[PDB]
Amino acid sequence: LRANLLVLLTVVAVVAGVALGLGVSGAGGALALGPERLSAFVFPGELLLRLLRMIILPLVVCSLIGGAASLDPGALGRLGAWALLFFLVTTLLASALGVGLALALQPGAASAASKEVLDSFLDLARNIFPSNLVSAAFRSYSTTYEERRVKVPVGQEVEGMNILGLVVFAIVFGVALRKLGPEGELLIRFFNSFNEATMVLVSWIMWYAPVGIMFLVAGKIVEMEDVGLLFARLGKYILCCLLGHAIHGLLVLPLIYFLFTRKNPYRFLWGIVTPLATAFGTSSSSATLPLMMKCVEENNGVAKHISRFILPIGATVNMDGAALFQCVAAVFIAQLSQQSLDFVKIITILVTATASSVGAAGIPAGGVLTLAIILEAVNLPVDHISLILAVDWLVDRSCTVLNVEGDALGAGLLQNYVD
Ligand code: NA
């Protein structure tokens, strides 16, 4: 079927990009290409990223408005509380697994290789309640410091979409529309139509996705000066990250799903393999959001009013893979600096990763800034982050799957809470 063809092409795009980038690097790489040729070579990946960033606003906002307006406020409140508990518990488990898998199997046992913590959470709270809806569509509040030599924190809005604030506003506005009654039907229909129109565009973009992924991966592995040396240096770190992701996705989340529902979790995952493949290929949660919702509603028995509400929220708040990656990177850096971590600092890492996972922006910087916040919370050198980013093109992808799987299973849990 053409859905299977698209999934196969999207997955094979990563392998083809890896091969193309290795060939280009072995044929001189960027120095042989030069800046002008390299920019054109990597441009298609940038085009794909721009296309994927375009859809996030209308898709998420309309989906959340519809999902919130399609449920009784009391039932919506109970469902949201349970979903938040599930997301927090899963993120905490991912962080704990990441820390445990790095203290053992030490990735940094070789010699080859800012905002205050309170101010970061105050900025998170400010972004949860945007001061302007139009501005929130492309800017987020951020605090810098001015010396008066007291470092007073002064804040301003800086580039970067405010997804968390818009999500909160969409949920509240949908609740208000539901409470209006027959007067709010027109707006519910309007936002549903907008959501369907946006999903059509997302489906069209999925066809160009493989070509963008090709050049994205090729350029991002051409930027590495030495593939062999870098991989020999970060082999154990990548092993820790991917092993933690595999353990969390294949053992922990399925175990929780079985314990609570007592149905087969792998039969559930078999119905969403296609969204998982799209997530791995594109590294975008919004890209798989429509396909994930379709598969969950059709292949699985999840009710529409459950999926349309839970999945858009999880795509923004549930970042198990990101938390695991951040904790593994923090332990790796702490081992590189030979700065022994005691129980207090381990708990600090866990709590900071869990708390900062909420509001992790969709941009690539959103998964590495939180790492800087964690390092500051524990007092680690940020200089080493250069290494961590160098393999994001792989690790981030592994994160994205774990960032969506936990969402789908989450819905699968709440369905049983409703049954
Ligand atoms: Na997610």
Curated annotation (Swiss-Prot):
It is found in: Cell membrane; Melanosome. The chain crosses the membrane at residues 4-33, 47-68, 83-105, 157-180, 190-217, 239-260, 306-332, 393-414. The keyword Acetylation applies. Its main location: membrane. Residues 34-46, 106-156, 218-238, 333-345, 380-392 are extracellular. Optimum pH is 7. Residues 266-296, 346-379 dip into the membrane without crossing it. Placenta, lung, skeletal muscle, kidney, pancreas, and intestine. Expressed in CD34-positive hematopoietic progenitors (at protein level). Residues 69-82, 181-189, 261-265, 297-305 are cytoplasmic. One of its GO terms (biological process) is transport across blood-brain barrier. Na(+) 2 binds at residue 316. Keywords: Acetylation, Amino-acid transport, Antiport, Cell membrane, Glycoprotein, Host cell receptor for virus entry, Host-virus interaction, Membrane, Metal-binding, Phosphoprotein, Receptor, Sodium, Symport, Transmembrane, Transmembrane helix, Transport. Regulated by L-cysteine, which can either inhibit substrate influx or trigger substrate efflux without being transported itself. Na(+) 1 binds at residues 314, 318, 403, 407. Belongs to the dicarboxylate/amino acid:cation symporter (DAACS) (TC 2.A.23) family. SLC1A5 subfamily. Sodium-coupled antiporter of neutral amino acids. In a tri-substrate transport cycle, exchanges neutral amino acids between the extracellular and intracellular compartments, coupled to the inward cotransport of at least one sodium ion. The preferred substrate is the essential amino acid L-glutamine, a precursor for biosynthesis of proteins, nucleotides and amine sugars as well as an alternative fuel for mitochondrial oxidative phosphorylation. Exchanges L-glutamine with other neutral amino acids such as L-serine, L-threonine and L-asparagine in a bidirectional way. This is Neutral amino acid transporter B(0). It comes from Homo sapiens (Human). The lineage of its organism: Eukaryota, Metazoa, Chordata, Craniata, Vertebrata. The chain holds residues 49 to 487 of 541 of the full protein.
